[PDB]
Amino acid sequence: IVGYSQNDLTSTERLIQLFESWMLKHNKIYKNIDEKIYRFEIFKDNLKYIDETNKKNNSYWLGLNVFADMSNDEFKEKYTGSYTTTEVNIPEYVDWRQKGAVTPVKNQGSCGSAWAFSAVSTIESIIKIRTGNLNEYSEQELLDCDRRSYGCNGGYPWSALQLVAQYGIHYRNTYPYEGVQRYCRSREKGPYAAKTDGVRQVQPYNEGALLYSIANQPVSVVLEAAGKDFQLYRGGIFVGPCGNKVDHAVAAVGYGPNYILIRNSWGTGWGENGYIRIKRGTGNSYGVCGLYTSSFYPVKN
Ligand SMILES: [Cl-]
Ligand code: NA
């Protein structure tokens, strides 16, 4: 499903009703009417692009997902959705969701905080893996408190992970997400909920290395997410196009023969209920969309 029937494309009235329908599906309410008209125009143009691109025989398809009313210029201006990131025998299949080690898909909103979401996801997972309990921890805390990062203007998964190793992290409910950087309120919220024992880097530009890490636990990884095809991604195995100018952090929560399974922080209305399967095995040392550029995971004894 791509969000529309071809009958929807046969007149301006149907297109409009389709847009109306899509707004409802995604709980979109606009500032004023001039906004709604502008949004319909963008929506119409992305639909044309979606329709023409899905005609071709590619291994993935696009769709009227949650970003269908945004121009790529707008989507890409902060780079990364709603510069999130700045500068031996393993199973055939791995999927940590199946082991109860992955929390429900989150939404970073209009804040370039994916570095924190990426880090928190891997911490949530390794604490489950080590202790048996799946908890939700605070992205907001890392957003506010990681002094090496830049809040909603982007940051570093490795710094966020280091903070949790050295100090700790509070529960989500204790320090909920606001999508805006405020002052660090860690000390106000009492004792930490969890604390890891360190951080490791996967050897970069090495697919086998990353797969091995994923087989042991979810891994924080980065990729170039700013492209229009990535923005409008609906499902299937993503082969590109994308360059190596990584700009966004995500979590690698699994893999299969042909892909790496990627947890994004753009909510469930993007991609495969929040996930994307990125092509692997192309021999290309960068990885597709530069996926092998910079990967870190938490250590928990
Ligand atoms: Cl690439
Ligand atoms: Na690529």
CSV table of C-alpha atoms and ligand atoms in Angstrom, one decimal:
chain,number,residue,atom,x,y,z
A,1,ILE,CA,0.0,0.0,0.0
A,2,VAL,CA,1.3,3.4,-1.0
A,3,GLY,CA,-1.6,5.6,0.4
A,4,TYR,CA,-3.7,6.1,-2.7
A,5,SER,CA,-5.6,4.5,-5.7
A,6,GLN,CA,-4.9,5.6,-9.2
A,7,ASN,CA,-8.5,6.8,-9.4
A,8,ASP,CA,-7.5,9.5,-6.8
A,9,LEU,CA,-5.2,10.9,-9.5
A,10,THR,CA,-7.9,11.6,-12.1
A,11,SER,CA,-9.1,15.0,-10.9
A,12,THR,CA,-8.3,17.9,-8.6
A,13,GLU,CA,-11.3,17.1,-6.4
A,14,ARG,CA,-10.2,13.5,-5.8
A,15,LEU,CA,-6.6,14.6,-5.0
A,16,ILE,CA,-8.0,17.1,-2.5
A,17,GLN,CA,-10.2,14.4,-0.9
A,18,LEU,CA,-7.2,12.1,-0.8
A,19,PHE,CA,-5.2,14.9,0.9
A,20,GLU,CA,-8.0,15.4,3.4
A,21,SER,CA,-8.1,11.7,4.1
A,22,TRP,CA,-4.3,11.7,4.6
A,23,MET,CA,-4.5,14.6,7.1
A,24,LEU,CA,-7.0,12.6,9.2
A,25,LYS,CA,-5.0,9.4,9.0
A,26,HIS,CA,-1.9,11.3,10.4
A,27,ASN,CA,-3.7,13.7,12.7
A,28,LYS,CA,-2.3,16.7,10.9
A,29,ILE,CA,-3.8,20.1,11.9
A,30,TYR,CA,-2.4,23.2,10.2
A,31,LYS,CA,-1.8,26.7,11.4
A,32,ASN,CA,-4.2,28.4,9.0
A,33,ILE,CA,-5.9,27.9,5.7
A,34,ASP,CA,-3.0,29.4,3.7
A,35,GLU,CA,-1.0,26.6,5.2
A,36,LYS,CA,-3.4,23.9,4.2
A,37,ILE,CA,-3.3,25.1,0.6
A,38,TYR,CA,0.5,25.2,0.6
A,39,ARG,CA,0.6,21.7,2.2
A,40,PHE,CA,-1.8,20.4,-0.5
A,41,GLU,CA,0.6,21.7,-3.2
A,42,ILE,CA,3.6,19.9,-1.7
A,43,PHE,CA,1.5,16.8,-1.1
A,44,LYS,CA,0.4,16.9,-4.7
A,45,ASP,CA,4.0,17.2,-5.9
A,46,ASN,CA,5.3,14.4,-3.7
A,47,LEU,CA,2.4,12.2,-4.8
A,48,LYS,CA,3.4,12.7,-8.4
A,49,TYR,CA,7.0,11.8,-7.5
A,50,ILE,CA,5.8,8.8,-5.5
A,51,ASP,CA,3.6,7.6,-8.4
A,52,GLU,CA,6.3,8.0,-11.0
A,53,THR,CA,9.1,6.4,-8.8
A,54,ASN,CA,7.0,3.4,-7.9
A,55,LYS,CA,6.4,2.6,-11.5
A,56,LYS,CA,10.0,1.5,-11.8
A,57,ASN,CA,11.3,-2.0,-10.8
A,58,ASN,CA,13.1,-1.2,-7.6
A,59,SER,CA,13.4,-3.4,-4.5
A,60,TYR,CA,11.5,-0.9,-2.4
A,61,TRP,CA,8.7,1.6,-2.8
A,62,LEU,CA,7.6,5.1,-1.6
A,63,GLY,CA,4.3,6.1,-0.2
A,64,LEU,CA,2.2,8.9,1.3
A,65,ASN,CA,3.8,8.5,4.7
A,66,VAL,CA,3.9,10.9,7.5
A,67,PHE,CA,6.2,13.3,5.5
A,68,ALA,CA,4.1,13.5,2.3
A,69,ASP,CA,3.2,17.1,3.1
A,70,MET,CA,6.8,18.3,3.4
A,71,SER,CA,9.2,19.4,0.6
A,72,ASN,CA,12.5,17.6,0.7
A,73,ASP,CA,14.2,21.0,1.2
A,74,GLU,CA,12.1,21.5,4.3
A,75,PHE,CA,12.5,17.9,5.5
A,76,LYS,CA,16.3,18.1,4.9
A,77,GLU,CA,16.9,21.6,6.2
A,78,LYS,CA,17.6,20.2,9.7
A,79,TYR,CA,18.6,17.1,7.6
A,80,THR,CA,16.7,14.5,9.5
A,81,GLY,CA,13.0,14.3,9.9
A,82,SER,CA,10.4,14.8,12.7
A,83,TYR,CA,22.4,16.8,11.4
A,84,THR,CA,20.6,14.9,14.1
A,85,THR,CA,24.2,13.7,13.8
A,86,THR,CA,27.4,15.7,13.5
A,87,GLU,CA,31.1,15.1,12.7
A,88,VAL,CA,32.3,-15.7,14.3
A,89,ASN,CA,29.3,-17.8,13.5
A,90,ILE,CA,26.1,-15.7,13.7
A,91,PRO,CA,22.5,-16.5,12.9
A,92,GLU,CA,21.1,-16.1,9.4
A,93,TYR,CA,18.4,-13.8,10.8
A,94,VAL,CA,18.4,-11.5,13.8
A,95,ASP,CA,15.5,-9.4,15.1
A,96,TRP,CA,15.7,-8.1,18.7
A,97,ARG,CA,12.0,-7.1,18.6
A,98,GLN,CA,11.2,-10.8,18.7
A,99,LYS,CA,13.1,-11.2,21.9
A,100,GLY,CA,11.2,-8.4,23.7
A,101,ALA,CA,14.3,-6.2,23.8
A,102,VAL,CA,13.0,-3.3,21.8
A,103,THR,CA,10.5,-0.7,23.1
A,104,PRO,CA,7.7,0.8,21.0
A,105,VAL,CA,8.7,3.1,18.2
A,106,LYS,CA,9.3,6.7,19.3
A,107,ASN,CA,9.0,10.1,17.5
A,108,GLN,CA,11.8,12.7,17.9
A,109,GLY,CA,9.5,15.4,16.4
A,110,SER,CA,10.9,18.6,15.0
A,111,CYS,CA,14.1,18.4,17.1
A,112,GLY,CA,17.4,17.1,15.8
A,113,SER,CA,17.7,14.7,18.7
A,114,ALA,CA,18.1,11.3,17.0
A,115,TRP,CA,21.6,10.9,18.5
A,116,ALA,CA,19.8,10.6,21.8
A,117,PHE,CA,17.1,8.3,20.6
A,118,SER,CA,19.7,6.1,19.0
A,119,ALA,CA,21.7,5.9,22.2
A,120,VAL,CA,18.7,5.3,24.4
A,121,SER,CA,17.3,2.5,22.2
A,122,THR,CA,20.5,0.5,22.6
A,123,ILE,CA,20.6,1.1,26.3
A,124,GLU,CA,17.0,0.0,26.7
A,125,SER,CA,17.9,-3.2,24.8
A,126,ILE,CA,21.1,-4.1,26.5
A,127,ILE,CA,19.5,-3.8,29.9
A,128,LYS,CA,16.8,-6.2,28.8
A,129,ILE,CA,19.3,-8.5,27.4
A,130,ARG,CA,21.4,-8.5,30.6
A,131,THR,CA,18.6,-8.3,33.2
A,132,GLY,CA,15.4,-9.5,31.7
A,133,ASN,CA,13.5,-6.2,32.0
A,134,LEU,CA,12.5,-3.9,29.2
A,135,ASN,CA,12.4,-0.3,30.5
A,136,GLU,CA,12.0,3.1,28.8
A,137,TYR,CA,14.7,5.6,29.5
A,138,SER,CA,15.0,9.3,29.0
A,139,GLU,CA,16.1,10.8,25.6
A,140,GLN,CA,15.2,14.2,27.0
A,141,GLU,CA,17.9,13.7,29.8
A,142,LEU,CA,20.6,13.1,27.2
A,143,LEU,CA,19.3,16.0,25.1
A,144,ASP,CA,19.5,18.4,28.1
A,145,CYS,CA,22.7,17.1,29.8
A,146,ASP,CA,25.2,15.8,27.1
A,147,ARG,CA,27.5,18.8,27.0
A,148,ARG,CA,29.4,17.5,23.9
A,149,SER,CA,26.2,17.5,21.9
A,150,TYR,CA,24.1,20.4,20.7
A,151,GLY,CA,20.6,19.6,21.9
A,152,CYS,CA,18.0,19.8,19.0
A,153,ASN,CA,20.8,21.0,16.7
A,154,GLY,CA,22.4,17.5,16.7
A,155,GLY,CA,24.9,15.5,18.6
A,156,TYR,CA,26.9,12.3,19.2
A,157,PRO,CA,25.6,8.8,20.0
A,158,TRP,CA,29.0,7.9,21.4
A,159,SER,CA,28.9,10.9,23.8
A,160,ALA,CA,25.4,10.1,24.9
A,161,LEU,CA,26.4,6.4,25.5
A,162,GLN,CA,29.5,7.5,27.5
A,163,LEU,CA,27.3,9.7,29.7
A,164,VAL,CA,25.1,6.8,30.7
A,165,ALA,CA,28.2,4.7,31.4
A,166,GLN,CA,29.8,7.3,33.6
A,167,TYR,CA,26.8,8.7,35.4
A,168,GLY,CA,23.6,6.9,34.4
A,169,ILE,CA,20.1,7.6,33.1
A,170,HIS,CA,16.6,8.1,34.4
A,171,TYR,CA,13.3,6.5,33.3
A,172,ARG,CA,11.3,8.1,30.6
A,173,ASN,CA,8.4,8.7,33.0
A,174,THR,CA,10.8,10.5,35.4
A,175,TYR,CA,12.2,12.8,32.7
A,176,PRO,CA,9.7,12.8,29.7
A,177,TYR,CA,10.4,14.0,26.2
A,178,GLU,CA,9.7,17.6,25.4
A,179,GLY,CA,11.4,17.9,21.9
A,180,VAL,CA,13.1,21.1,23.0
A,181,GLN,CA,16.4,21.4,24.9
A,182,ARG,CA,16.1,22.7,28.5
A,183,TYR,CA,18.6,22.8,31.3
A,184,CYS,CA,20.0,19.6,32.7
A,185,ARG,CA,17.6,18.4,35.5
A,186,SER,CA,19.3,15.1,36.3
A,187,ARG,CA,20.0,16.1,39.9
A,188,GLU,CA,16.4,17.1,40.6
A,189,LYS,CA,15.1,13.6,39.7
A,190,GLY,CA,17.0,11.7,42.4
A,191,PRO,CA,19.0,8.4,41.9
A,192,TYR,CA,19.6,7.1,38.3
A,193,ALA,CA,17.4,4.3,37.1
A,194,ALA,CA,20.2,2.5,35.3
A,195,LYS,CA,23.9,2.9,34.6
A,196,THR,CA,25.9,1.0,32.0
A,197,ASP,CA,29.6,-0.2,32.3
A,198,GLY,CA,31.0,1.3,29.2
A,199,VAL,CA,30.9,2.0,25.4
A,200,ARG,CA,32.4,0.1,22.5
A,201,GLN,CA,33.0,1.1,18.9
A,202,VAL,CA,32.4,-1.4,16.1
A,203,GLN,CA,35.4,-1.4,13.7
A,204,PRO,CA,34.1,1.1,11.0
A,205,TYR,CA,33.6,0.4,7.3
A,206,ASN,CA,33.2,-3.3,8.0
A,207,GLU,CA,30.0,-5.1,7.4
A,208,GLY,CA,30.9,-8.4,9.1
A,209,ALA,CA,32.0,-6.5,12.1
A,210,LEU,CA,28.7,-4.7,12.4
A,211,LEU,CA,26.7,-7.9,11.8
A,212,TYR,CA,28.6,-9.7,14.6
A,213,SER,CA,27.8,-6.8,17.0
A,214,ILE,CA,24.2,-6.8,16.0
A,215,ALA,CA,23.9,-10.5,16.7
A,216,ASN,CA,25.1,-9.7,20.3
A,217,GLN,CA,23.0,-6.6,20.9
A,218,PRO,CA,21.4,-3.6,19.1
A,219,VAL,CA,23.9,-1.1,17.8
A,220,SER,CA,23.8,2.7,17.4
A,221,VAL,CA,24.6,3.5,13.7
A,222,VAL,CA,24.5,6.5,11.5
A,223,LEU,CA,23.4,7.1,7.9
A,224,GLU,CA,22.5,9.7,5.3
A,225,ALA,CA,18.7,10.1,5.8
A,226,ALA,CA,18.1,13.5,4.0
A,227,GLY,CA,17.2,12.2,0.5
A,228,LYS,CA,13.7,12.4,-0.9
A,229,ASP,CA,13.5,8.6,-1.3
A,230,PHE,CA,14.5,8.0,2.3
A,231,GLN,CA,12.0,10.7,3.4
A,232,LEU,CA,9.1,9.1,1.4
A,233,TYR,CA,10.2,5.5,2.1
A,234,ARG,CA,7.2,3.1,2.6
A,235,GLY,CA,8.6,-0.5,2.5
A,236,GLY,CA,10.9,-3.0,1.0
A,237,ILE,CA,14.7,-3.3,0.9
A,238,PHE,CA,16.3,0.2,0.4
A,239,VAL,CA,19.2,0.2,-2.0
A,240,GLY,CA,19.5,3.9,-2.4
A,241,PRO,CA,20.0,6.4,-3.9
A,242,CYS,CA,21.9,7.9,-1.0
A,243,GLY,CA,25.4,9.2,-0.4
A,244,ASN,CA,27.9,8.8,2.5
A,245,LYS,CA,27.4,12.2,4.1
A,246,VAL,CA,25.8,10.6,7.2
A,247,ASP,CA,23.5,13.0,9.1
A,248,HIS,CA,21.2,10.9,11.2
A,249,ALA,CA,21.5,8.3,14.0
A,250,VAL,CA,19.3,5.2,14.3
A,251,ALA,CA,19.4,1.8,15.9
A,252,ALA,CA,20.4,-1.5,14.1
A,253,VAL,CA,18.1,-4.0,15.8
A,254,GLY,CA,18.6,-6.9,13.5
A,255,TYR,CA,19.4,-8.3,10.0
A,256,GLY,CA,18.9,-10.9,7.4
A,257,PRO,CA,20.8,-12.3,4.3
A,258,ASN,CA,20.2,-9.1,2.2
A,259,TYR,CA,19.6,-6.3,4.7
A,260,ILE,CA,20.2,-4.7,8.0
A,261,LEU,CA,17.1,-4.0,10.1
A,262,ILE,CA,17.0,-0.4,11.2
A,263,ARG,CA,14.8,1.3,13.9
A,264,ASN,CA,14.1,5.0,13.2
A,265,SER,CA,12.7,7.7,15.5
A,266,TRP,CA,10.2,9.3,13.1
A,267,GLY,CA,7.2,7.5,14.6
A,268,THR,CA,5.2,4.5,13.1
A,269,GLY,CA,3.8,6.5,10.2
A,270,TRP,CA,7.2,6.3,8.4
A,271,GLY,CA,8.6,3.3,6.6
A,272,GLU,CA,7.7,-0.2,7.9
A,273,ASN,CA,5.9,0.8,11.0
A,274,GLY,CA,8.9,2.9,11.9
A,275,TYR,CA,11.6,0.6,10.5
A,276,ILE,CA,13.6,0.4,7.3
A,277,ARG,CA,15.5,-2.6,5.9
A,278,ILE,CA,18.7,-1.3,4.3
A,279,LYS,CA,20.5,-3.3,1.7
A,280,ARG,CA,23.7,-5.0,2.7
A,281,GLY,CA,26.3,-7.1,1.0
A,282,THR,CA,27.1,-4.7,-1.8
A,283,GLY,CA,30.9,-5.0,-1.0
A,284,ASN,CA,30.8,-1.2,-0.6
A,285,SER,CA,32.8,-0.5,2.6
A,286,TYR,CA,30.8,2.6,3.5
A,287,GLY,CA,27.6,0.6,3.6
A,288,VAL,CA,24.5,1.8,1.8
A,289,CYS,CA,23.8,5.4,2.9
A,290,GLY,CA,27.2,5.3,4.7
A,291,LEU,CA,25.7,2.9,7.3
A,292,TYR,CA,29.1,1.5,8.4
A,293,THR,CA,30.6,4.9,9.1
A,294,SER,CA,30.2,5.2,12.9
A,295,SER,CA,28.7,2.5,15.2
A,296,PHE,CA,28.7,2.2,19.0
A,297,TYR,CA,27.0,0.1,21.6
A,298,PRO,CA,26.7,0.1,25.4
A,299,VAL,CA,28.4,-2.4,27.6
A,300,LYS,CA,26.5,-3.8,30.6
A,301,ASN,CA,28.1,-6.5,32.8
B,1,CL,CL,26.9,4.4,0.1
B,2,NA,NA,24.6,4.6,-0.6
